Symmetry: C4
Subunit: 347 residues, 4 copies
Amino acid sequence: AMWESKFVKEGLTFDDVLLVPAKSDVLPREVSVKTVLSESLQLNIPLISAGMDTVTEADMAIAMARQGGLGIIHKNMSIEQQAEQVDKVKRSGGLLVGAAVGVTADAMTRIDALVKASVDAIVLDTAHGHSQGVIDKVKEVRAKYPSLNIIAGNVATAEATKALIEAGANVVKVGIGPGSICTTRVVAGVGVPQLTAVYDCATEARKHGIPVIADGGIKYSGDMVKALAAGAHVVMLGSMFAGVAESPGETEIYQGRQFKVYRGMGSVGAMEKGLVPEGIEGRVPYKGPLADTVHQLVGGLRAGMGYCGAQDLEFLRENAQFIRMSGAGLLESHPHHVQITKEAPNY
Amino acid sequence: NAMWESKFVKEGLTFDDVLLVPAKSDVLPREVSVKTVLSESLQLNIPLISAGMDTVTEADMAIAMARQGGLGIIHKNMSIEQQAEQVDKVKRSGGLLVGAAVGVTADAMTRIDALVKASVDAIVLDTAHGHSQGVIDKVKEVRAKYPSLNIIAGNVATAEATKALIEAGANVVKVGIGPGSICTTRVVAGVGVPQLTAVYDCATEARKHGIPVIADGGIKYSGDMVKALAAGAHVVMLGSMFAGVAESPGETEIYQGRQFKVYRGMGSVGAMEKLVPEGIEGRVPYKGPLADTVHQLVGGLRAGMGYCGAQDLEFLRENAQFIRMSGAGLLESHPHHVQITKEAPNY
Amino acid sequence: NAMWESKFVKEGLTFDDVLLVPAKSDVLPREVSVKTVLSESLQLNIPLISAGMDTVTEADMAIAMARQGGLGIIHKNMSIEQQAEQVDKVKRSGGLLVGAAVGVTADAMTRIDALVKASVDAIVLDTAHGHSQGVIDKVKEVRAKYPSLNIIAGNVATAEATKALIEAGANVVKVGIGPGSICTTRVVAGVGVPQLTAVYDCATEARKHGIPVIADGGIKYSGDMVKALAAGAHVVMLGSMFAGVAESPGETEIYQGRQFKVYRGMGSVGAMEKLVPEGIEGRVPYKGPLADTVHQLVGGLRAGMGYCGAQDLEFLRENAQFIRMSGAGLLESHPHHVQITKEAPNY
Amino acid sequence: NAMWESKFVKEGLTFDDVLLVPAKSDVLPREVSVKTVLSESLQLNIPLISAGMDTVTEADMAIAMARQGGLGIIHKNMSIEQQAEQVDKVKRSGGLLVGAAVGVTADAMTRIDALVKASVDAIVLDTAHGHSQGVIDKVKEVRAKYPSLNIIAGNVATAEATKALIEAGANVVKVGIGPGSICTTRVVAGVGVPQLTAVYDCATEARKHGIPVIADGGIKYSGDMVKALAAGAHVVMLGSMFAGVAESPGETEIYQGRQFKVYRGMGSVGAMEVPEGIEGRVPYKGPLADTVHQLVGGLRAGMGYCGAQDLEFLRENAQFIRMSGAGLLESHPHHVQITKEAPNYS
Ligand SMILES: C/C(=N/O)c1cccc(C(C)(C)NC(=O)Nc2ccc(Cl)c(-c3nc(C(F)(F)F)cs3)c2)c1
Ligand SMILES: C/C(=N/O)c1cccc(C(C)(C)NC(=O)Nc2ccc(Cl)c(-c3nc(C(F)(F)F)cs3)c2)c1
Ligand SMILES: C/C(=N/O)c1cccc(C(C)(C)NC(=O)Nc2ccc(Cl)c(-c3nc(C(F)(F)F)cs3)c2)c1
Ligand SMILES: C/C(=N/O)c1cccc(C(C)(C)NC(=O)Nc2ccc(Cl)c(-c3nc(C(F)(F)F)cs3)c2)c1
Ligand SMILES: O=c1[nH]cnc2c1ncn2[C@@H]1O[C@H](COP(=O)(O)O)[C@@H](O)[C@H]1O
Ligand SMILES: O=c1[nH]cnc2c1ncn2[C@@H]1O[C@H](COP(=O)(O)O)[C@@H](O)[C@H]1O
Ligand SMILES: O=c1[nH]cnc2c1ncn2[C@@H]1O[C@H](COP(=O)(O)O)[C@@H](O)[C@H]1O
Ligand SMILES: O=c1[nH]cnc2c1ncn2[C@@H]1O[C@H](COP(=O)(O)O)[C@@H](O)[C@H]1O
Ligand SMILES: [K+]
Ligand SMILES: [K+]
Ligand SMILES: [K+]
Ligand SMILES: [K+]
């Protein structure tokens, strides 16, 4: 049966569907965008800044936390430098902060230094979360810190979600290949369309009461609404936060216009800092302070929740209905046959 | 339970996904009847309505539209007294037909009072989400005060939303969520329904109530109008195909030696200056007098009805058959492998 | 009742949607026979007909096409006496077979009388909608006056229309509504059927009466012609691939130091001068003598018949099997990921 | 009659239509084995073959390919003795493996005689249509004269064509009609089968006889190679990804300010001096070892995601998931300006 079912499975991505409007008794200004990942970790907005060397550092995680979100300090630095940055964030009013940790031999010594800075969640993020080495590390970390929030990823199947939950992780991160700087699906030929991956993983984690994180693939505020409506509790962003003033990336000039360096953790340049690469090096347009971008994201989420009549996010993921779409409909969803003179804050 | 499992079941079709199949014909395009009835007090010689936008329809536009057999909708982005005078200006010019857009805002009741005293033929209660409870309650409020008034309500995209507006008092339902050429709702909120599916679904519900529907937005060629009418719509509402017309309120400007007219969305930042925007500002080529483009639109409709053998518009929507098509069929339907030297009036 | 529910059931396929599947072959491309028979009085050495357009086929084109084993169609954009002289000129110059297009006007009989006295080999009653009652009555009228004349009727795209023309008196049916490279019928009227589905459906009906069908329009490569013949068509009609030929009526024009020839549709505004157009005016690159492009066309057919093992065209249309493909497969079928250095005769 | 109604029933899938599904893995990419066996006399350390073209594979290319664990195919666009000199020149250094292409012609047997006397390890009977009767009769003719020779026959794309070559005498089947980057067969003749379906269809038939299949043409990224092997192919044959390499026969030219190498199809008008190929240029990519390292490294990454301990576990257990064009846009880098050209992505 394994030979005959090679090409049976089918996947859906963000640009394949649309959210169906339903009866609404709530106004967009009145909806609540709050979400809870655990009793020790509660966010006012479902936005997380990814743990990359060009997205989130001490300055970024602070600005993200002041807005109700969460920042993830990347692991491409020394153990003592990462612990001080976590302490620097917590010093600004005891905000919420996370830190990425790789499945290395010295991971436990890195994790020990982070908990003494009272980090709120660690992220055991790797390219393949369904690996045996990743599962054993989760059992190893959970045994030493029973009350710590453990985020494990990345995965894209329901079987991989269940395996990490049984290893000790209470938060599962979903996404293999949808990143804007990712080339895994081109280099390794491996991947699962995000919207299907989120739906499959959230279905498995929902019967255990485990939240899932939609990580990667979001390029517009509407895609964030689709990810949350597919079963995800929160969304993790990289490209939409890289052009923010608070991000660590370096400023470069292109065509007389400011840009910010945005690289993947699998790029050759990010590798030296930390055999074949699975990411590319690039630049994103400068978008100014973080607060401007966040208002457009939440404002786009409030509009979508108003169309579906969802007062809270849990009503959205439990009731929102999609409609499948062709390629010609995607051009219909975007502005067409009109010369765009002014570029909108959201577009 | 069942709402979670039916997340990705529905399928949607747009204009560029299908084609009308030719059938037995005993009528020539010059002989068909393009007359349509929206109510016993509202009858149009051609099934064309100009949308109520600050860059499409004003007093001058509504006059030329009505003298051509169509209908104009005066936009609401002006004072109540300025809008009532424009309505009177049209009526005074030979007893033509004119409509006016009205929001579910607080000045709707006082605005409708001034419009009905100006002998307006129809009001349009159009909002971003016509399936809202606030919109439904206003329709009951307006219908209770004006039992014989023509009320156009929208916008909707599901059959259940059509039933709700019909049950509230509206005798014409406007269909369209996201297909506007200047619309960004599907990018910002992730919400929308493909037009051809939306029209078919809404018209199916309103057909058992004897209620006509308006295909609003999405039309970029005259053939798109024929598909909308054959899909179940009684009339079609156009915006982008009328903005570059001399009778539109915008003024003609030059960019790169070519004539253009400003075309903005009602949800764009510019229209509201007069939370998160859902429209953009753009440019359309100047198309000369209104009579030129209307002659091309109706002439394209007469040709399409000749191919289908439709003597009436009722025969078209009750008998016309579609055929689904791929993306490669879309490129074959448009001119291909020929460099175009002369720009056609319809193309 | 039932016509409303079957509105979007049908599916159509175009040229770039499929590929011919290789089969067991015992014949070499140099050995296959490309001869086809349309009637006892009309037999072609090659299955190529030049369309009857004022920028494709005139006396010079019909002569060169007939000396190559094909057939030319003199267009009808001239006087009855002008067209009869062109037909006579071809037969006096050595043209073996020649045809002439005739419109469904009141003076059609007077035009046909002059053509048969010029010893025309086939008349073409080509209109936009061959399933019209006026066209059917004209076919019955011509068959009653000339029982032995070769009558080509079109254009149609359904099996229902094919039976009507065959029962009216036509022994050759021409298929194609909307696939022309200069055609805008599907954009202006919204009416059309994908060529490969139309040919297959029409050939299915004409096969039960022993009637050949003509695949007219849509062909842009030699592979598309093989697909048209394998779908059930006896011969193929070309327009854009012959417009840049030296024997075409157009005169060579130069743009940016490169030679061009005018190629316009019969529904374009310019053609009609000599008000709702269904065609556009354009230019195609000059390709030199006709024999060069015909050599590439026939050579491409011989290769395809070799891949399928078809010794005859009748074996090809009766046995060849297709395989359906997505848009990503089309990108593979064309040269990709390599910069093309020289202009190939085929590509 | 029954052939008429099943004209448009079949469906085909290509590389960019699917993705490999990640599975449980207990192995790292550095630990997997990429070795494959085509016959008792033919074993390769890597599943890479350089195609037999006059702008891809020559003596130097076959040496570097063999020293890297792969296999080179000396093309036939040269004299019989010059091709035999190339085969011996390869065997002279390190006693490495080498192959040679042979066309179906009346003088084919004499070309094969010179190659076997040069101790060629496998001959490749490459044609446009491997399901032709003339090709099958040649396979029977060569097998009758050489019982111990490794015979690679192609190209095919259907299960019946695979079965015909196996029963004709070929122990390796070559799959691919129309997917070449320089190929225009599907545009000129309208004939072809999407590679991934063709490989799956051919491998299903060749699996019942213990016969390996070669995924020939269409690969443009390392992920396409991983998909081809997981679909049933034992090895992959490449042309465009090896043509811009320093060991390829072309010399470096500057066109539009960039270094390029000539890459032409065997059916193009230039090689034949009705074409079914075009002449083109690919960027210069330097030494072969760099491009081979990127290809194999991508295979190890893919095999790590699937939990494939060996290549035989990959082709027997890897599962695909189908995707639309919008999912294809998500698979590539998107909405980001690319400043640096990656070794595996360009
Ligand atoms: C037509 C249209 N297309 O975008 C549009 C026109 C003008 C302004 C807007 C803006 C940009 C302001 N966007 C929304 O108004 N977005 C939105 C999103 C979701 C809901 Cl649920 C609602 C509702 N509005 C009401 C009303 F107050 F009208 F009664 C009840 S519910 C509204 C949109
Ligand atoms: C081939 C073609 N493709 O568009 C074409 C060629 C020349 C002119 C036209 C124009 C632009 C004039 N377009 C129509 O003629 N369009 C049209 C549309 C629908 C019908 Cl039903 C009919 C009919 N004409 C007749 C006739 F008078 F011939 F008897 C009977 S029914 C005609 C089209
Ligand atoms: C590989 C390849 N790909 O296109 C190719 C390589 C070189 C030349 C050609 C040319 C341009 C010459 N094209 C054909 O050779 N095209 C073709 C088309 C259909 C058939 Cl059925 C056959 C046959 N070959 C044989 C042989 F005996 F040689 F094997 C018997 S029949 C051949 C193609
Ligand atoms: C997140 C991410 N996305 O691409 C990424 C980040 C940094 C580096 C890489 C590179 C480019 C180095 N690529 C792989 O790391 N590729 C890869 C491919 C296949 C497997 Cl099976 C594994 C595994 N690593 C482990 C470990 F335990 F070491 F963490 C268990 S399994 C890893 C990828
Ligand atoms: O270099 C890499 N290779 C593959 N995936 C990456 C790489 N770097 C970051 N990612 C993933 O991409 C996500 C964010 O991508 P984005 O928000 O879509 O641009 C991260 O949270 C990671 O899961
Ligand atoms: O700014 C806006 N955002 C979203 N939809 C709009 C906006 N302004 C107008 N519309 C709708 O889009 C239609 C325009 O259709 P179109 O120009 O023919 O594509 C209008 O008639 C309204 O129904
Ligand atoms: O102006 C027109 N409008 C629509 N169809 C046309 C027009 N002129 C010619 N045709 C048809 O479209 C075909 C175009 O052939 P092509 O250029 O090979 O695609 C002709 O052979 C006619 O059957
Ligand atoms: O000119 C030709 N016409 C058709 N196919 C060719 C031609 N030359 C090479 N090929 C095929 O294309 C393959 C390599 O193409 P690639 O995908 O660019 O690596 C070869 O192994 C052949 O099967
Ligand atoms: K839109
Ligand atoms: K067309
Ligand atoms: K190709
Ligand atoms: K990607």
